[PDB]
Motif scaffolding. Sequence first.
Motif, PDB file in Angstrom:
ATOM      1  N   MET A  12      21.043 -90.613 -59.834  1.00  0.00           N
ATOM      2  CA  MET A  12      20.240 -90.997 -58.669  1.00  0.00           C
ATOM      3  C   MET A  12      21.158 -91.332 -57.500  1.00  0.00           C
ATOM      4  SD  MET A  12      16.960 -93.549 -58.309  1.00  0.00           S
ATOM      5  CE  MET A  12      17.819 -95.120 -58.210  1.00  0.00           C
ATOM      6  N   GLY A  76      -1.068 -80.772 -62.920  1.00  0.00           N
ATOM      7  CA  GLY A  76      -2.243 -81.593 -63.104  1.00  0.00           C
ATOM      8  C   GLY A  76      -2.071 -83.038 -62.699  1.00  0.00           C
ATOM      9  N   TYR A  78      -0.755 -85.968 -62.991  1.00  0.00           N
ATOM     10  CA  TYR A  78       0.442 -86.670 -63.466  1.00  0.00           C
ATOM     11  C   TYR A  78       1.208 -87.176 -62.246  1.00  0.00           C
ATOM     12  CZ  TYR A  78      -1.162 -84.457 -67.667  1.00  0.00           C
ATOM     13  OH  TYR A  78      -1.969 -84.058 -68.706  1.00  0.00           O
ATOM     14  N   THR A  79       0.621 -88.162 -61.566  1.00  0.00           N
ATOM     15  CA  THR A  79       1.187 -88.672 -60.320  1.00  0.00           C
ATOM     16  C   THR A  79       2.648 -89.068 -60.511  1.00  0.00           C
ATOM     17  OG1 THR A  79      -0.961 -89.419 -59.472  1.00  0.00           O
ATOM     18  CG2 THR A  79       0.974 -90.525 -58.562  1.00  0.00           C
ATOM     19  N   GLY A  80       3.501 -88.547 -59.626  1.00  0.00           N
ATOM     20  CA  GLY A  80       4.928 -88.825 -59.642  1.00  0.00           C
ATOM     21  C   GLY A  80       5.787 -87.844 -60.415  1.00  0.00           C
ATOM     22  N   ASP A  81       5.165 -86.980 -61.216  1.00  0.00           N
ATOM     23  CA  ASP A  81       5.908 -86.094 -62.116  1.00  0.00           C
ATOM     24  C   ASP A  81       6.155 -84.705 -61.523  1.00  0.00           C
ATOM     25  OD1 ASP A  81       6.018 -88.212 -63.862  1.00  0.00           O
ATOM     26  OD2 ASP A  81       4.260 -87.555 -65.037  1.00  0.00           O
ATOM     27  N   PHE A  86       7.718 -75.790 -60.429  1.00  0.00           N
ATOM     28  CA  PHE A  86       8.283 -76.095 -59.119  1.00  0.00           C
ATOM     29  C   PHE A  86       9.786 -75.823 -59.141  1.00  0.00           C
ATOM     30  CE2 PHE A  86       5.074 -79.917 -58.874  1.00  0.00           C
ATOM     31  CZ  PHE A  86       3.998 -79.029 -58.888  1.00  0.00           C
TER      32      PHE A  86
ATOM     33  N   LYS B  10      -0.858 -85.175 -56.597  1.00  0.00           N
ATOM     34  CA  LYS B  10      -0.435 -85.274 -57.999  1.00  0.00           C
ATOM     35  C   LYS B  10       0.559 -84.154 -58.314  1.00  0.00           C
ATOM     36  CE  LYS B  10      -4.639 -87.807 -59.130  1.00  0.00           C
ATOM     37  NZ  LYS B  10      -5.658 -88.091 -60.201  1.00  0.00           N
ATOM     38  N   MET B  11       0.595 -83.679 -59.550  1.00  0.00           N
ATOM     39  CA  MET B  11       1.599 -82.679 -59.913  1.00  0.00           C
ATOM     40  C   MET B  11       1.043 -81.276 -59.669  1.00  0.00           C
ATOM     41  SD  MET B  11       4.058 -82.381 -63.260  1.00  0.00           S
ATOM     42  CE  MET B  11       2.870 -81.629 -64.375  1.00  0.00           C
ATOM     43  N   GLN B  67       4.983 -89.883 -54.343  1.00  0.00           N
ATOM     44  CA  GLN B  67       4.094 -90.370 -55.400  1.00  0.00           C
ATOM     45  C   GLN B  67       4.676 -91.467 -56.293  1.00  0.00           C
ATOM     46  OE1 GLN B  67       2.524 -86.921 -57.542  1.00  0.00           O
ATOM     47  NE2 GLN B  67       2.071 -85.873 -55.591  1.00  0.00           N
ATOM     48  N   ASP B  68       5.954 -91.786 -56.109  1.00  0.00           N
ATOM     49  CA  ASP B  68       6.661 -92.779 -56.919  1.00  0.00           C
ATOM     50  C   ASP B  68       8.050 -93.003 -56.322  1.00  0.00           C
ATOM     51  OD1 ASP B  68       7.142 -94.456 -59.230  1.00  0.00           O
ATOM     52  OD2 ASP B  68       8.244 -92.791 -60.166  1.00  0.00           O
ATOM     53  N   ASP B  80      15.491 -90.022 -61.728  1.00  0.00           N
ATOM     54  CA  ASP B  80      14.714 -90.919 -60.859  1.00  0.00           C
ATOM     55  C   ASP B  80      15.051 -90.711 -59.382  1.00  0.00           C
ATOM     56  OD1 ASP B  80      13.488 -91.854 -63.141  1.00  0.00           O
ATOM     57  OD2 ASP B  80      14.840 -93.592 -63.360  1.00  0.00           O
ATOM     58  N   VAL B  95       3.369 -94.070 -53.119  1.00  0.00           N
ATOM     59  CA  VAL B  95       2.408 -94.628 -54.069  1.00  0.00           C
ATOM     60  C   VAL B  95       3.164 -95.389 -55.147  1.00  0.00           C
ATOM     61  CG1 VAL B  95       0.528 -94.064 -55.682  1.00  0.00           C
ATOM     62  CG2 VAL B  95       0.857 -92.701 -53.609  1.00  0.00           C
ATOM     63  N   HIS B  98       0.186 -96.205 -59.544  1.00  0.00           N
ATOM     64  CA  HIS B  98      -0.959 -95.356 -59.843  1.00  0.00           C
ATOM     65  C   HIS B  98      -1.299 -95.484 -61.327  1.00  0.00           C
ATOM     66  CE1 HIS B  98      -3.488 -91.811 -60.278  1.00  0.00           C
ATOM     67  NE2 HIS B  98      -3.647 -91.883 -58.968  1.00  0.00           N
ATOM     68  N   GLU B 100      -2.050 -93.396 -63.496  1.00  0.00           N
ATOM     69  CA  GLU B 100      -1.389 -92.398 -64.342  1.00  0.00           C
ATOM     70  C   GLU B 100       0.028 -92.855 -64.698  1.00  0.00           C
ATOM     71  OE1 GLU B 100      -2.142 -88.961 -61.848  1.00  0.00           O
ATOM     72  OE2 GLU B 100      -4.280 -89.107 -62.349  1.00  0.00           O
ATOM     73  N   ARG B 101       0.717 -93.512 -63.768  1.00  0.00           N
ATOM     74  CA  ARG B 101       2.056 -94.015 -64.074  1.00  0.00           C
ATOM     75  C   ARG B 101       1.995 -95.270 -64.939  1.00  0.00           C
ATOM     76  NH1 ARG B 101       5.460 -90.757 -62.657  1.00  0.00           N
ATOM     77  NH2 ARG B 101       7.073 -92.070 -63.639  1.00  0.00           N
ATOM     78  N   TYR B 104       0.812 -93.448 -68.545  1.00  0.00           N
ATOM     79  CA  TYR B 104       1.720 -92.461 -69.147  1.00  0.00           C
ATOM     80  C   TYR B 104       3.177 -92.912 -69.131  1.00  0.00           C
ATOM     81  CZ  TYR B 104      -2.193 -89.154 -68.450  1.00  0.00           C
ATOM     82  OH  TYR B 104      -3.409 -88.524 -68.441  1.00  0.00           O
ATOM     83  N   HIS B 105       3.513 -93.802 -68.200  1.00  0.00           N
ATOM     84  CA  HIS B 105       4.919 -94.147 -67.975  1.00  0.00           C
ATOM     85  C   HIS B 105       5.232 -95.637 -68.082  1.00  0.00           C
ATOM     86  CE1 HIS B 105       5.863 -89.974 -67.283  1.00  0.00           C
ATOM     87  NE2 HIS B 105       4.907 -89.906 -66.372  1.00  0.00           N
ATOM     88  N   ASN B 106       4.317 -96.381 -68.699  1.00  0.00           N
ATOM     89  CA  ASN B 106       4.582 -97.773 -69.093  1.00  0.00           C
ATOM     90  C   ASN B 106       5.027 -98.642 -67.921  1.00  0.00           C
ATOM     91  OD1 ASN B 106       6.168 -95.880 -71.516  1.00  0.00           O
ATOM     92  ND2 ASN B 106       4.170 -96.854 -71.880  1.00  0.00           N
TER      93      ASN B 106
END
Lengths: 256, 255
Positions: A12, A76, A78-81, A86, B10-11, B67-68, B80, B95, B98, B100-101, B104-106
């Motif tokens: 990062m 779909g 999966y916000t942030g992913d 891509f 989103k994705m 989104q993160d 990251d 964001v 969310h 979803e995070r 799905y991402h604890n």
Amino acid sequence: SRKPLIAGNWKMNLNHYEAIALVQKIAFSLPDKYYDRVDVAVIPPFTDLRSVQTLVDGDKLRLTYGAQDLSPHDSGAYTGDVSGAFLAKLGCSYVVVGHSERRTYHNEDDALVAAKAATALKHGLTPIVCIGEHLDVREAGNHVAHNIEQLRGSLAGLLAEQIGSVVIAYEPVWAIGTGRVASAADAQEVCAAIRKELASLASPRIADTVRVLYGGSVNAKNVGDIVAQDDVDGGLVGGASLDGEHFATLAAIAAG
Amino acid sequence: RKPLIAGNWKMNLNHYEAIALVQKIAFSLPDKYYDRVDVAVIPPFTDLRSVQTLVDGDKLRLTYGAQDLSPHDSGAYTGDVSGAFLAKLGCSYVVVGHSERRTYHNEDDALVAAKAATALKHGLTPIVCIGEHLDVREAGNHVAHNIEQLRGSLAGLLAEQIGSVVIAYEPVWAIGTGRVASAADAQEVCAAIRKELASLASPRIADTVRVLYGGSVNAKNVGDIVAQDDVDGGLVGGASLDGEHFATLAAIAAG
């Protein structure tokens, strides 16, 4: 013989301006002749990829590039992913899966890594599948068996020809923040065992083509000894990858 | 409060699909609306360079965000993305938390609060998402639960910092459960959110904070929702991927 691969994991670090500057510094610093003898890749943060694509395509650079992670899904909610679709459209060659930092900070398990590797391959990317044992396991004298189980888990379900399309990276996690140092001999012991297991999971012929990288501390003083080993095919480089001259030097050493 | 319509892609969408979507929104939304509504797109990380150069190069009035982000500024966090990178790319929003995070991402409230603080340190406006599950809603404890999640997700922020966040309420209990959240439901929670923001700051400061509805938003319901006193717009899901539809939502919110 397998052609060596020097892949720089930026982690990062570096905004898009800095990414442009670093790629241009690497291109300036590494004489063209070396690309015939070593493959060189940069692995920037997601937000830097388009910038790197522009330079690589516009200057017809011989270096390649990749990303540091991807989703197991194609698209779909999966916000942030980020999707392998891509990454493929950005011209990525590689994607790192199962890096020890993601296993630590993001709880990634072997099954998830295997799913990410399959998704990477679906999008025509070469996953760099990272494995490696922690201090307690190393101290128990378990240099090989734990790594073999992690390799089996992290490649679970892949077809033999898919295994022939991955890169493995061994991270001696036992040598991260512990004060321990992994020698080139230590790297060779594990990488030889990885290759023998690949021969079983796939075939001997396929395993002889798979590049197995060392992903511990790689710098100008140790890269030669590391790549000199029979079963070590290069490095997944950390901090040295952020200095263009130093990174070029690593590639030159690996080549010659 | 000036309403805000922010499109969470989103994705979805690669970098040249991203350019086309932004151009579709700009084509579809008459310029007169920007004085009356803020409009943002929130693409995947890998689309940000393409969106930034289009928005800056064509002097578009649309803004954008991510989104993160990591709670850290830099370092050994493979995979990251830093708020510093987002800021250098001209993002206005990010964001955090969310659903979803969170699932799905604890991500817990403490991590969301850390991400919100880090967003602010990089000059980004965090869109802090909260929302309760069906069991909580069924028990009638939805207001209290949202206030506790808000407090936890804003932990460490002082009065002056409160004015620099956006909140989004996701009625998670209505996602894939068959249930439908009404404008009245949105108003009940968003009013309680503003009351808590007032306690963490003041009624005046809280009255500057945009509180968005983050449930299912379309052309037939957006008007009723944004008409509510304490609802200031939307964090839009699927409709954000259709440029025409998204522009329509912005026009309705503008009034």
